[PDB]
């Protein structure tokens, strides 16, 4: 049982939120590679720990992430010209570097210090494995950028599919781990026909990781079959893999009650779909199952477009793409999710354990420690699945 | 002249709100039999009280009406299997029956209850009630439902407004003279006269009105008298004509959304059908309203009033009298300020609601039975009439019961 | 800076804020002449300091500006019947003339003197419907403004309901830099100087404020300067340098705390002066193109304006058509209020300080009881105009002897 | 088994056409009593045997059908001004009234007697059982209008569903003389609406009349298959209607005019007792023919072949047959698949397809016998009493024996 | 110069029609496997030469291929139920199976009839027929581009409203690429080369013909040219020069006279090949958002192929995306049947020229009782392939030892 109040402190991310600031400690996914195109390419909208920014490629391919409102009269860059290693503002004509120096102002006699002065709130960026990383936290506070657990080095295949979801990050992830919901949920989608699993939870430092006990076919007298999915502070899961490549969810919250989900399959070039496999396989499209801005047309007033035919013929949901599904569910319990009136069993220990780790470390970050996963995963403490006696994946 | 308190009292209905908790202690349609379909149907999405609610017809075509989120994880039930006895969350699989049990958890080895409340099927609609359990009387017929060889079509649409004026409006026999009157033509009535004299009776379960106009021959020592019966908490027993008889029940799906039900009824050989009714009223799903019933007509679209059609000397331009109606409700705003309202002659039934529906809250909250409770509820005896009568007559009077043949 | 509250009290005007009453003090457009029609013609919806309006033409030929809402029930006017000499409404037949007295009660004995409707004295000049909306002994006698002197004028209105607060409209139209900046593509219209950072010069008046924008001419910037000269007129008025054949004027009311209607006047003689379907062609507000039937406008933040990239890479400045839609992208981006806290202002924003000094000073002697601004022997008339020269380093332009373009 | 030029002879009905003037030889549906709606209302298009017709109810409620287009320079008189007993075309103010007789020429002195001297295409009319009527043929030819054969007298219920189809009519009506189809395609829809009987293969009789001819479908019962037959009796009232079997409240008939040779009026019709037939609104949601819905303005509908008629492969998974909803419509689904005019030339046709052969025999030999100059089959001295009908019939008791009426109460 | 008649000839594959006889002689692509799914799958309609077809998945996983109309009374198959080891026509209850079977007649007693159905063969993503004179039909050899069964082939389908042979000149017209797809296939795709207009060289033989495209390499073009080499097998299959990493093919099949399938396919090494929907996304042909769900393409004449004429300023040559959908334009607006009467042909044209001249004799000769062109012993092997490569001025590439792109 959690009270209002300490629901408000998981989950608000925005401003002066405590979780906020936590997780502004991490590097942070801002949008996808594939959004910012060629040098002086088009300028694209983000959103970010309720924070509207600016994203664009200059003249020299560096990635600038930024304020989306200019620094003089507020109004937006994403209007601008992005030329000649700047972006220009379409008002005055103030122009940034993707470092957020005014490189000029071509209305403001700049034979005069006001040029030289003026900073503009600007991020350090990195580009890793499909996405572009900015940090958000304070300057000083920047860490290496040390490669994730989900892209050893870039011999790898990434392939992502965006979302942007009209809830609470909290909730979103929380579906990642959890075990029982493949079992009714995705039971026409997903070596185990076992809807109840039996769950174990061992805490490390950049998170968590936890198994799930199902009886395969028979030999269950020997055998567990084990799922092992990690939690990977804050906003991370490594879902346990397939027999080909592996698969992980990070999350992003864009503000209160809306979240960038970034569904990952990666692995072996020669074992890991491409890109638009994936998104298809996942109906995920752009242009199909989502509209130009990753947001999906699926919604609470064409009920997802669930099919009650497809349902009274056999099939579980009666929506198509698994993720969906899951989509139906979150966006269900509401914006922010009220984990007051929850009534939890033994096949959400690990919701639970995920509800105390994340609460005991806003505390903890809030009385001055250092941030959760900050310490001194990685890419070969992953997730797992194999029929395990009682008591990553490449080629 | 009433306070911004006495409306917000008179007018919220969710959460704790007086008005809510009594409305509660009646009997109250949910949505529509039609919607549920047969046994094992697609769920239904309804709201009522500031409450959203799961109804459905199970295997055996008992019908439940729950609290639409699971009591697992709060994922939307309206989304779960319906077969076998019971109705499946999505998510986890849990399956409750209508009463409330949950039968089975698929993902875990009288455990846990879910809201849910009891039903009951009556003359196209299916009831819940929704007060404390042990409050709940046993079903009587409404007013306007004698037995179930009774014909009832029922138009329902869904409108953006709070419950009180679309009541106000259908106990208002001045407007049919203005509003109605390219609808409602010397539909034919025996009078001109757009001003009645307006005379009240109260009773046990709410009150009756009359409206007494001049009619085309005789007025020396005759009264045309139109009566209508207000059945607290929001019911309206229209005059009939001379086939059929009128009805409007309006239940509140929260402080400024209302489930609107207009019924007609009456022998079945003499009470128009479902459709014909819809077609009637412009009240046709698919043409009039979306499928979740709500009015394609709007604010933005003018609820499709014809400018020219006015010139041509139709009176309002809006087809369909109901939704001529609705025009004037969802104009005055999502909760109509009666602080600011200058009321007249022709208001005096909605004064008398406007004081007993306040009396009604004031004595409820202090304690007493809900209005229209108890030995006080009316039945099929208490009804609407219109006929010439003479001025030596007491309206009071008048022995009538509802036409049929 | 300037802090929350200065630009709360410089902003809001919705019911009680000082600066709506301030505004009330002055006539002001309600809606165009063209919206009501003929003599008994559809009841016209508007809205001004967040009240909803009627507008209607009687069978006399008489507008009328009441409110929207029936006195007797509050069921909205604009569905009512407009002939006989008034506007009835549907649901109970309550029938007002323009002047707000109740005719007639169709549902009533008359034991109708009583009620009155509340109504606004209104006027018909220059295209425009205009309404006192304050207290009615303060109505001064409607005067032509600067920018409609008599009858014989062309004035040609684009009008566009804005869904953002009406400062920043109004900035807008006294920030010199910007037509060298976002409008680069446009008025590359005739200007003899390609000069982008304009040296700004104030002169304080009683009606608001001229200000000056001296650019390097192409020719001999050795001793002459290309003056650029706008009025404000309080409180929400811009006259813009004219061009040589007409003139240009932008009103805008404040329709709420966050809507504005905006209209963008050509002005000058009929024959040099474009027509009214000319000037929304032009500025791509034509209604059914441009703007829906409301003149709302059809772009918006989700369609980017319509901003066209190809077209951008490809010369165009801010690959939007229409120089208006340009400025619109800018002020619906910086927010339904603009948070001018947050601005950092140089030596090109003098005017736009000017009037946030000017107002804000405006509205706090208003709350004391001062007259307010450019009300009575102060306000502006014809001979107050705005212009385009070159004029000599050595000439005051202050002193420079401009009328408005005619012939 | 049949040819090109029988099919012709068979499916054509454009001016030229045999089949055409023995079709006018019959008073023919033109339009719902609906459509024309008030004295002075509005003007309404239809379209038989490839005339394009005006249809307007004048100022005394008398309702003229005439040719589309005016007789002065030939403007559209749909688009004309219906008041003042007549109907003004808008180009020259050139006004008719309902016998065609040209009142006015708003724009010709009437010092011109051209005013008296013309006369417009119209053709004489009959409102019944909720459809204007006219006959189309030679004046001369015109018959009484003998109340026909599913509209007995005034006070019965007729409740229409009307349906503009882009095919040929031979192949619609052959759609309601085929009492096998409905066990295959209304399968989930006809749920043994109720029959009584699992019977797919029904052994087909026969018998000519002087009208048409009746046809019976023996089927065995779910109860005394040993001795009792299931009789389901059709009448094809040439030239194209068919009397389908009523249930067990009210009849149901279809009459069908081809609006030309690639396109047809359906009228589907259930009539009987006002307290037992359905109004026209419930008939038409049980069908899915609601106009707005189903269809357009103009009666024409919106599944078709571009959408696949609606057809949900989920539902037909699910144990629905066909996957259509609205039994006609899954008529429509197969009847325009076959094309605008079917090909009959390669139809492998079954001891199931009798009537349908039988339909094809007569009027291929009543349309030759008519080319000729015999009466028009159906004309002649050839009502309400002959019907059809259904019962549990005795085996030894021939089922054109039978006496059974339409069903009434 | 070519005449009507011939062009008639050439072009014409419906009913009596000797290019559809010749055509019907080979294995033709019918649809895609991807269209049919599952056992039981929702039946497909299709049309090659004239005539529509249903295909169907059946419960054990056979493909049948069968006239659309039942053989009962011609309605559409396509709406039957697909179940039990047949489709089941709705209206009556005729059952057929893959092979054209009647199984069974819902309406008919129980106490040999046959439908129209050609074999099928399902390979590289495809289902073909056979649709020709059964006893005419060879055993199914792998085409030359889709060798085994551990080849990626990923294939873009759609469906076109030109004939077939216009569709299939544009595979085979090496000099079109520098100019039309000079956006797209740069000095994104690139080539060793920035010449235009390029010597070109052709070997008939017994499948269709190989021809060479000769540009003048970057450098060295003294002693080395750059040789690029198309193979045209008859009758519309051409193999497209590979880039370094994967080939390409292009199949069409004539729905029609006036409509062809058209098949653009990526094909080599798993670990070098893309997969259909990267393959499609490159090419903008993807289902849902270029091409409707039958394929056919949402642009058209009407939206000028969404030609951006922005874009075209800012030095894109077509403003059309996708190198395709560049071609589609070109050849729909040629009109439904290029009249190749009022062509004017030169010499980038050669091999062109060399279609037209080798198909008009192979029909011709077809009709005296010729073997259709390319079967029997004369039939193209995956041996032939398509290449570039920097090669000797004096090495004959007609003899080159050039193999398909793997690795
Ligand atoms: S607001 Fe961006 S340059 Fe002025
Ligand atoms: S929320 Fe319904 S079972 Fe989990
Ligand atoms: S509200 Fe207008 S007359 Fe009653
Ligand atoms: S064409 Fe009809 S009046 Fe002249
Ligand atoms: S038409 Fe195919 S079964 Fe009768
Ligand atoms: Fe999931
Ligand atoms: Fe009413
Ligand atoms: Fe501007
Ligand atoms: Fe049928
Ligand atoms: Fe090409």
């Given at each position: 049982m959690m009270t209002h109040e300490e629901n408000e402190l998981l989950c608000r991310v925005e401003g002066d939120a405590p979780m906020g600031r936590l997780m502004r400690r991490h590097w942070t996914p801002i949008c996808l590679?594939?959004?910012?195109?060629?040098?002086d390419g088009t300028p694209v909208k983000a959103r970010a720990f309720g924070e509207d920014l600016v994203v664009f490629r200059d003249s020299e391919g560096r990635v600038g992430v930024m304020d989306?409102?200019?620094?003089?009269?507020?109004?937006?860059?994403?209007?601008?010209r992005n030329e000649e290693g700047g972006l220009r503002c379409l008002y005055h004509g103030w122009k940034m570097d993707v470092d957020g120096?005014?490189?000029?102002?071509?209305?403001?006699?700049?034979?005069?210090?006001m040029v030289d002065k003026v900073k503009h709130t600007a991020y350090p960026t990195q580009e890793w494995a499909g996405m572009v990383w900015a940090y958000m936290g304070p300057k000083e506070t920047m860490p290496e950028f040390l490669p994730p657990?989900?892209?050893?080095?870039?011999?790898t295949r990434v392939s992502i599919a965006k979302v942007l979801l009209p809830c609470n990050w909290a909730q979103i992830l929380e579906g990642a781990i959890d075990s029982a919901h493949s079992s009714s949920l995705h039971s026409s989608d997903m070596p185990s026909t076992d809807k109840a699993p039996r769950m174990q939870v061992q805490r490390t430092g950049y998170g968590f990781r936890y198994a799930a006990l199902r009886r395969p076919l028979?030999?269950?007298?020997?055998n567990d079959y084990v799922r092992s999915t990690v939690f990977v502070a804050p906003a991370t899961a490594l879902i346990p893999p397939n027999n080909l490549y592996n698969v992980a969810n990070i999350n992003v919250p864009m503000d209160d009650t809306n979240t960038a989900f970034y569904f990952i399959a990666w692995g072996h070039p020669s074992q890991t779909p491409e890109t638009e496999t994936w998104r298809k396989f996942l109906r995920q499209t752009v242009g199909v199952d989502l509209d130009q801005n990753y947001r999906?047309?699926?919604?609470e007033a064409n009920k997802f477009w669930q099919d009650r035919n497809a349902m009274k013929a056999?099939?579980?949901?009666?929506?198509?793409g698994f993720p969906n599904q899951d989509v139906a569910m979150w966006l269900t319990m509401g914006?922010?999710?009220?984990?007051?009136?929850d009534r939890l069993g033994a096949s959400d220990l690990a919701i639970v354990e995920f509800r105390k780790q994340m609460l005991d470390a806003v505390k903890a970050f809030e009385q001055?420690?250092?941030?959760?996963?900050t310490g001194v995963a990685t890419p070969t403490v992953c997730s797992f699945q194999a029929i395990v006696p009682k008591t990553y994946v490449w080629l």
């Open positions: 590679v594939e959004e910012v195109g060629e040098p989306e409102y200019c620094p003089h009269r507020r109004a937006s860059l994403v209007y601008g120096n005014v490189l000029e102002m071509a209305s403001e006699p700049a034979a005069s210090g657990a989900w892209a050893p080095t870039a011999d028979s030999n269950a007298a020997e999906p047309l699926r919604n056999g099939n579980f949901t009666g929506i198509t914006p922010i999710a009220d984990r007051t009136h001055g420690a250092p941030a959760i996963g």
